[PDB]
Amino acid sequence: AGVMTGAKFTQIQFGMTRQQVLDIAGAENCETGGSFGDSIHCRGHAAGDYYAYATFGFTSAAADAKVDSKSQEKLLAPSAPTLTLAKFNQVTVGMTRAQVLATVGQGSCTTWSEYYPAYPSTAGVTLSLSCFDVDGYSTGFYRGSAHLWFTDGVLQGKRQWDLV
């Protein structure tokens, strides 16, 4: 129990069951059905609009199904956000994840969504990063952010908001 947190999000692993996820997240924070189908959505602090959250997807509806999908917003902070528009412009589709981080800053990104369509195999893995200027994840003037998305660790596209 306690609120859903970045710590709990990191604790939860690909391969875990629904019961394991609820056990770690705290069932009082989480919901299934409705808008989320057979995924489990776990809520951070009830701030009103745009509250922090995680969503966990599973291989099937079976009780023994495994986490194949982890998404979050506003639970994890970038370690050293330094994205700029010039850096963003230097990123090109086809780049590896490694090449992207070297370009935008090694601590500029967090993982928005990560899905394994052949879990436990990594074949076809999709990954969305959110990356940030210095105040992008905060308050503060440098509020730019970006969404970079990969399939098999290779960049398929990018989009930005408010970058300078």
């Binding site: 808008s35 989320f36 189908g37 995924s39 959505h41 009830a46 701030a47 009103g48 609009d49 745009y50 509250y51 959250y53 969503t55 997807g57 998404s71 917003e73 928005w112 969504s113 969305s128 959110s130 509020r143 952010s145 969404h147 998305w149 398929q156 596209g157 989009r159 908001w161 408010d162």
Partner: protein, 265 residues
């Protein structure tokens, strides 16, 4: 305890911001309580009620169906999209998108719906068509939340928004079925707990939509009343305050509490 106007002035003082509100009788449309009701405030996610009014008007006209499935891709996603991100692979119906935009402030959902009504320009044209000559949407999510001081883009006035809500929900602008559906999405609002709902007595009706923006922008549009009946429209906006989300939540709740305590009168 204090009278609504006095509570509002206290909130404005404590926030070091500006507050704008109106309380309007639903049936008659008469103004009951007003403060800065003709001044402009960023709509933030409160615009999504107008957005889905436009969607329903197309449904009434046969140009749209709530059961229509829309598919979309990574490039369509903007920040804060709990529901639309979950349904990336499967798509969502128009009705599911409105439910997500209104009840969860899902930003990408609003952008998908915005495209169906001809974007901000198209939504603003709808506003003008229904006789709102003040409210304007200019940008898409998430830039519409920017709330630059003095910038008229993406703003309404408490008075205009209250009138427009009344038009959408009780006039012939929408079919009866579309009226009930728009109301229902607001009844089912999931993220409005900290505001009026936090001080709403058991047994009262409430249907609402909230918004949060930059520079302290915060807002609620609501229909509420005792005995499980919608009686009045209450619109409360905040802007240009450095206060925390929680303080902003508390202040709106306090204004709500005053209106509720002093309801009769």
């Amino acid at each position: 305890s204090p009278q609504p106007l006095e509570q509002i002035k206290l909130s404005e003082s404590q926030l070091s911001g500006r507050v704008g509100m109106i309380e309007m009788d639903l049936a008659s449309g008469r103004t009951l309580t007003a403060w800065r009701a003709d001044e402009r405030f960023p709509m933030m996610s409160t615009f999504k009620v107008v957005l889905c009014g436009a969607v329903l008007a197309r449904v009434d006209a046969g140009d749209e169906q709530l059961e229509r499935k829309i598919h979309y891709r990574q490039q369509d996603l903007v920040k804060y999209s709990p529901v639309s991100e979950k349904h990336l692979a499967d798509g969502m119906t128009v009705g599911e998108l409105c439910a997500a935009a209104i009840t969860m402030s899902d930003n990408s959902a609003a952008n998908l719906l915005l495209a169906t009504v001809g974007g901000p320009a198209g939504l603003t044209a709808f506003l003008r068509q229904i006789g709102d000559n003040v409210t304007r949407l200019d940008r898409w999510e998430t830039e519409l939340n920017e709330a630059l001081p003095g910038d008229a883009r993406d703003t309404t006035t408490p008075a205009s928004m209250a009138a427009t809500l009344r038009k959408l929900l009780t006039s012939q602008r929408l079919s009866a079925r579309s009226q009930r559906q728009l109301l229902q999405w607001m009844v089912d609002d999931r993220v409005a707990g900290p505001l009026i709902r936090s001080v709403l007595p058991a047994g009262w009706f409430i249907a609402d939509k909230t918004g949060a923006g930059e520079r302290g922008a915060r807002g609620i549009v609501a229909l509420l009343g005792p005995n499980n009946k919608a009686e009045r429209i209450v619109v409360i906006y905040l802007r240009d305050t450095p206060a925390s989300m929680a303080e902003r939540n508390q202040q709106i709740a306090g204004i709500g509490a005053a209106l509720i305590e002093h309801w009769q009168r």
